Design a protein around this ligand. Sequence first.
Ligand code: HEM
Ligand SMILES: COCCCC/C(=N\OCCN)c1ccc(C(F)(F)F)cc1
Length: 426
Amino acid sequence: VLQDVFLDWAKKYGPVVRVNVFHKTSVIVTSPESVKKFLMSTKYNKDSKMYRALQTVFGERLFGQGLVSECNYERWHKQRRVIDLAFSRSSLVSLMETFNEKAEQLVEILEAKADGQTPVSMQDMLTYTAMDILAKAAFGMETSMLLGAQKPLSQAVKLMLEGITASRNTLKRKQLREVRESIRFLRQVGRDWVQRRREALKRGEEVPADILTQILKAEEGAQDDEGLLDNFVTFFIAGHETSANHLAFTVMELSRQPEIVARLQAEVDEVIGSKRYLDFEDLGRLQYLSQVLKESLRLYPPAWGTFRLLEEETLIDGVRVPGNTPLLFSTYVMGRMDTYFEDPLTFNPDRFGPGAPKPRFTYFPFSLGHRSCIGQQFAQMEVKVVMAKLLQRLEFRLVPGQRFGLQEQATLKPLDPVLCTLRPRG
Ligand code: HEM
Ligand SMILES: COCCCC/C(=N\OCCN)c1ccc(C(F)(F)F)cc1
C-alpha cells in the first residue's frame, strides 16, 4: 500500500518529508514531538482541501459537513458539544444490550457453519455484525444483514466505498453512476429513518437517548435537512467500517497466532466462563484481549492517519515548512518504525502489558486531541464483546490461498476477505 512507501521515505529521509497524497502535496511528519505539538492543540485544525474529497464524491454529497469532514473549528465544536452527550458513560453502558445481542447472533450463525469445511468470509460476517450494531445503537433500527436482510443497502455501502477509492485516486462508464446511485440510496435510507423517527415522536412515543436524537438536536433551526443527512451518512459509515476492518484484521492475524489464541481462550474462560451475555464491568477485566486489540491497531490501523493545516510557516524538526501546507500524521507509519517500536513487524501484545511505558505520541489509531474519535470507547466496547464471544465459542483456521496483507480503499482493510473454516471449541 501507499502507506508503506511513506514509511520507507520516513525511515530514509527523516521526520519531515514532502509527499503526494490523493494527488495533492503535503508534509508527512513523523516525530513524536511534532505529533504532540500539532495534535494536542486546538490551534491546529483539519485541512479542508484534504477532506474535500470525503465531503462530496463524484458530484454527490456524502459526508458533507458532518462530524468527520467539518474542518472549521467553531462549526465543528458546535455539533461536537451536543453529539458528545450520546457518548457519555451512561449512554454507552445502555448499549451493552445491542452489542451482546448482535455478538450472540453472529456466533450462532457461525456455529451453524462450523463443520470445518464451509468457507466463511469473516470480513463480510464482521461488516454485517458492525452495521447491525451501528444501525440499532445509533438509529434504533434493525438491518438484519446477519440474516440476509437489507442486501441492497449492504451493496450501496460497498459501491460507495470503492467510490471514495476512485474519487481520491485512480487518476467503466456504468460503475461511476452506480456510485452516485449508492450515495443517494444512503441519503434516502437516511431520510426514511429520520422520518420514521419524527413520526414516532409525533405519536408522542417514548424514545431513549441516541446518536440520532443528538444529531437532530444539533440541526435545530436549520432551513434544510442536508446538515442532518450529512451526519446520518457520516455515522452510518464511520460507526461500522473502521470497527469492521479492525475486527477483520484481528481475526486474520490470530489465525496464525496459536499461542496468543490459547492465552486469549484461557483469559475469557476465567472472566466470563460460559455465560451468554457480558456485563459492562466484564470488559474492563479482558486485559489480555485489550492488549491484542491495541497491537492489532498498531500494525493494522484502519484509519491510518489525519491532516492538519499549517497556516504560518513554521520550523518542524529543523526543517522550514512553508505556510498553507497540509501536515500528514500517520499511526501506520510510526507503528512500523523500529525507532519507536523494537522489531516492529512482530505482533507482540506484551508491548501493551501492565507496567510497559505507554507509547508516547508514536501510536494513535483513534487519532489524538480534539479531533480524536468520538467513538473510541464505543468501538472498544463493541470490539471486546464480539471478540470475547468468538473466542468463547469458536476456532478459525484460514483457508489455504488466503493472504495476509492490505488494501488502501477508504480505510485500510485486509486485501483478501478473511475466508475461514470454523470449528466449535473442543
Ligand atoms: C476500531 C474502530 C474505530 C477506529 C480505529 C476509529 C478511528 C478514527 C480516527 C483515526 C478518527 C479520524 C480522525 C481524522 O480524520 O483526523 C476518527 C473520527 C471519528 N470517528 Fe472513529 N474509529 C472507530 C470507530 C468509530 C465508531 C464506532 C464511531 C461512531 C459511533 C466513530 C465515529 C467517528 C466520528 C464521528 C469521528 C469524528 C469525531 C470528530 O471530529 O469530532 N468511530 N475515528
Ligand atoms: C468512508 O471512510 C470512512 C470515514 C473516513 C475514514 C477515516 N477515519 O474515520 C473513522 C471513523 N470511525 C479516515 C481515513 C483516512 C484519512 C486520511 F486523511 F488519512 F486519509 C482520514 C480519515
